[PDB]
Specification:
It catalyses: pyridine + thiamine = heteropyrithiamine + 5-(2-hydroxyethyl)-4-methylthiazole. It is found in: Secreted. GO terms for molecular function: thiamine pyridinylase activity. By secondary structure, the protein is of the alpha/beta class. The protein has 2 domains: 175 residues, Periplasmic binding protein-like II (D-Maltodextrin-Binding Protein, domain 2, 3-Layer(aba) Sandwich); 181 residues, 3-Layer(aba) Sandwich (D-Maltodextrin-Binding Protein, domain 2). Helix content is 38%, strand content 18%. The protein has 15 helices and 14 strands. Strands 1, 2, 3, 4, 7, 12, 13 and 14 form an 8-stranded mixed beta sheet that branches. Helix 1 packs antiparallel against helix 12, helix 12 runs parallel beside helix 13 and helix 13 packs antiparallel against helix 14.
């Protein structure tokens, strides 16, 4: 018996998850063979032969309504009390749980240790008042000046627009019905362009030849820029400098902020020939031991991935050795947190949004 699996690829070190998963699986099911495949939810719907797979929750609605998935009964979830309440609910549709939260992700504001003026900012506007408009188009920005943020790619802009829209309207929604691409919300465009202003056109749109998704974390560490807005996992790239920066959540509006998190959930194909085994493997891929082993450094010279896990246990275990996770736990344990979800028509809407957003911005 062979189960085809696919892990989430957009992580600092994919091989570490795979190594962790296979290792733990052998302990419980040595008779079952795992075959890892390349699959990106961002580009394709689940192929008919892929039994278990991790996907970004923005496609969950579509996957569910298309009949691609198999739900998890309360009897099929191991230690459900350990999962962060909001992450588990963000995985529900039609009153059923359709995925086990494995990784969480959000944008943070990274600033340097002594730099207090920046550490008191709460939203992008107050942030503008401190760093102002970026004067140069050079890559990277001059030492200690400008804002570092990755706004390259049509999907990133489209996602930021939607996340911003929730913060503006002060109302959280799973976007079952996606907003019109015409006319666009100005308060949102006004804010996205303000980010591009503090960062500069060239720098914000720059894509590295090597495809290093975390290069800006390298620049920030070297001394480039005044502030950096990126994912927590960017801290792995900072290496030893990770201990030299502070971070905090930043609101896209000026009033009541709704903290949004991307959630990567493990799901089971409705076409699987081994539903109970696949449901077991999904639990393994989302268990505290697996995720803990994948976030921790394996060989010497490796740093923690600094990804946000979805279980309390993982945070409690990691924070002994890595104090950073103690600060990350406070961030994820806030009351108002919600998972970023999008409607079933997310694919066509995205496709259309890319043709209008760059224009609306410049």
């Amino acid at each position: 018996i062979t189960l085809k699996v696919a892990i989430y690829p957009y992580v600092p070190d994919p091989a570490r998850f795979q190594a962790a998963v296979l290792d733990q699986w052998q302990r419980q099911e040595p008779g079952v063979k795992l075959e890892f495949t390349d699959w990106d939810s961002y580009s394709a719907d689940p192929p008919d032969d892929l039994d278990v797979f991790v996907l970004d929750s923005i496609f969950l609605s579509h996957f569910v309504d298309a009949g691609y998935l198999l739900p998890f009964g309360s009897q099929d979830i191991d230690q459900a009390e350990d999962v962060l309440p909001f992450a588990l609910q963000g995985a529900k549709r039609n009153g059923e749980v359709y995925g086990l939260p494995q990784i969480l992700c959000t944008n943070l504001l990274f600033y340097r240790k002594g730099d207090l003026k920046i550490g008191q900012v709460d939203n992008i506007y107050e942030l503008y008042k401190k760093i102002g408009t970026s004067h140069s188009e050079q890559i990277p920005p001059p030492q200690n000046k400008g804002l570092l943020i990755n706004m390259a790619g049509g999907t990133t802009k489209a996602s930021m627009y939607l996340e911003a829209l929730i913060d503006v309207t002060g109302q959280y929604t799973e976007y079952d019905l996606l907003p019109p691409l015409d006319p666009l919300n100005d308060k949102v465009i006004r804010g996205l362009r303000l980010l591009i202003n503090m960062a500069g056109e060239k720098p914000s749109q720059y894509v590295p030849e090597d495809g290093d998704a975390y290069v800006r974390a390298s620049w920030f560490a070297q001394g480039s820029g005044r502030a950096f807005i990126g994912y927590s996992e960017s801290m792995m790239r900072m290496g030893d400098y990770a201990e030299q920066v502070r971070f905090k959540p930043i609101s896209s509006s000026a009033g009541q902020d709704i903290p949004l998190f991307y959630s990567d959930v493990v799901s089971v194909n409705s076409k699987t020939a081994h539903p109970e085994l696949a449901k077991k493997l999904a639990n393994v891929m989302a268990s505290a031991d697996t995720v803990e082993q994948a976030l921790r450094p394996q060989a010497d010279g490796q740093y923690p991935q600094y990804l946000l896990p979805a279980r309390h246990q993982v945070y409690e275990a990691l924070m002994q050795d890595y104090p950073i996770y103690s600060e990350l736990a406070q961030i994820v344990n806030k009351p108002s947190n919600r998972v970023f979800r999008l409607g079933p028509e997310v694919r066509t809407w995205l496709k259309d949004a890319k043709q209008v957003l760059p224009e609306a911005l410049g």
